[PDB]
Amino acid sequence: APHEERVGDMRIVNITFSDINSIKNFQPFSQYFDFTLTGPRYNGNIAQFAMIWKIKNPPHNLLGVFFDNNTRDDEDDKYTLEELKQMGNGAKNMYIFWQYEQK
């Protein structure tokens, strides 16, 4: 809670999973993923399977980005994760899904 970052009114939630298969069972967010795609995606709006837009130059272990509210620019290979953090456009939470890297 105290270590979590915010961008404006938007809270950045970094949730870590063992693997992408674990996210299939994660209600209520699994419904927004498209689990057939390669490389992490973000959603341009709220709709089922909406997370299809390809994040540009992603860091290791990033699995996807879900904005819980509003809409934004929807383009493949244009926005880095850092740009996306400025693109909430009224979303109150930006959920960023990470794969655990065993140290």
């Binding site: 498209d34 795609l37 089922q48 399977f49 493949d76």
Partner: protein, 36 residues
């Protein structure tokens, strides 16, 4: 079934496209919705 644009056989939802109903995979059909 295969996506008329990207040719995948795996998608969580077949979507309508300019060629016909359910002819696009989920991603391609969302891209199509975007471009008119």
């Amino acid at each position: 079934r295969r996506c008329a644009n990207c040719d995948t056989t795996s998608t969580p939802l077949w979507r309508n496209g300019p060629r016909g109903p359910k002819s696009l995979c989920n991603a391609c059909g969302i891209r199509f919705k975007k471009e008119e």
